[PDB]
Amino acid sequence: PQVELFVKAGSDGAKIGNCPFSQRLFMVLWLKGVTFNVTTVDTKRRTETVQKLCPGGQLPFLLYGTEVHTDTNKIEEFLEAVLCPPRYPKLAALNPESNTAGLDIFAKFSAYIKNSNPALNDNLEKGLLKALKVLDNYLTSPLPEEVRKFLDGNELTLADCNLLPKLHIVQVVCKKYRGFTIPEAFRGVHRYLSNAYAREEFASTCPDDELIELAYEQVAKAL
Numbered sequence: 001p002q003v004e005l006f007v008k009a010g011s012d013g014a015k016i017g018n019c020p021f022s023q024r025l026f027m028v029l030w031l032k033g034v035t036f037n038v039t040t041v042d043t044k045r046r047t048e049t050v051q052k053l054c055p056g057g058q059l060p061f062l063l064y065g066t067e068v069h070t071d072t073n074k075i076e077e078f079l080e081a082v083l084c085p086p087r088y089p090k091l092a093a094l095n096p097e098s099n100t101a102g103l104d105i106f107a108k109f110s111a112y113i114k115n116s117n118p119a120l121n122d123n124l125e126k127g128l129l130k131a132l133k134v135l136d137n138y139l140t141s142p143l144p145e146e147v148r149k150f151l152d153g154n155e156l157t158l159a160d161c162n163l164l165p166k167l168h169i170v171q172v173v174c175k176k177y178r179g180f181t182i183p184e185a186f187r188g189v190h191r192y193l194s195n196a197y198a199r200e201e202f203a204s205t206c207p208d209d210e211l212i213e214l215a216y217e218q219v220a221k222a223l
Contacts, residue, residue: 001065003036005029006050008059010211013042018207018215020106021072022060023165026205028076031091031156032083076158091158098152098159101138104131106166113173113216118223125180128170132186139188149195156201164202167193172212177220 005025008017016022017040029036041050041059054061058070062078069075080092093099108131112124143153151159171193174180182189196202 002063003029003034004063005036005038006041006054006059006061006063007038009040009042010207011214013045014040016040016205016207018169018212019060020165020169023168023205023207024072024161025060025062025075025079027156027161027164027201028079028091028158030201030205031161032079032088034083034088076161080158091156091161093152093157093159095143095152097138098157099162101151101159102131102135102163102167105135105163105170109166109170109174113177113220116221116223121223128174129183132182132189136186136188139192150192156199160196160202164196165206167196168202168206169212169216172209173216173220176209176213177216177222 005022007022007026008019009015010017016038026038041047043057043059046057051057053063053068054070056070060072060075062069062075064078064082069078080090084090105128108124108128112121112128115121115124139148139151142148145153148154150156151163171182182193184190
């Protein structure tokens with residue numbers, strides 16, 4: 001059953017654009033081991049064929065055989081279910097908590113980078129740091145095997161596929177527009193990212209820095 005993921009086209013209208021939802025799904029298909037294609041979509045020049053497949057224009061979406069699936073949480077719940085052992089690994093996390101550690105980081109990041117207000121900047125900065133801190137604590141707090149590279153153990157899971165693309169954007173945009181870096185004293189967070197960038201599943205599905213940045217340029221205002 002041919003699998004095809006349709007994603008955000010970058011600036012030239014051809015290559016892979018900035019979007020943590022497309023990367024997340026790219027990462028899952030990769031981890032699933034299935035054969036699949038990725039097809040970029042310029043939303044300001046949509047092909048005839050895409051309007052037929054996906055009238056609503058939602059992106060990303062998944063052509064599974066003849067079925068169209070929209071909404072990133074659904075597309076992933078669908079893949080995890082239908083691409084399943086023995087032929088394909090189960091990717092879901094075993095600890096419910098892996099699925100929520102850090103979930104708040106992105107929202108605090110967005111609030112922080114969109115803010116033009118100099119007076120609020122230290123609250124927002126500090127908000128982001130505490131959220132990173134909670135993640136750092138979940139990452140160093142031993143999981144129910146004890147006598148670890150990623151959120152839920154030593155294998156990449158759905159939880160990482162969701163969190164990693166968002167973390168990447170956070171790092172890359174905060175560096176560029178705010179001179180902000182994740183403190184080195186979050187060792188748990190920094191081994192996690194070192195381990196993540198060492199895996200091609202994550203490394204190879206990252207949009208280039210220059211694309212991540214360009215996309216947040218209108219939004220990210222100086223103080």
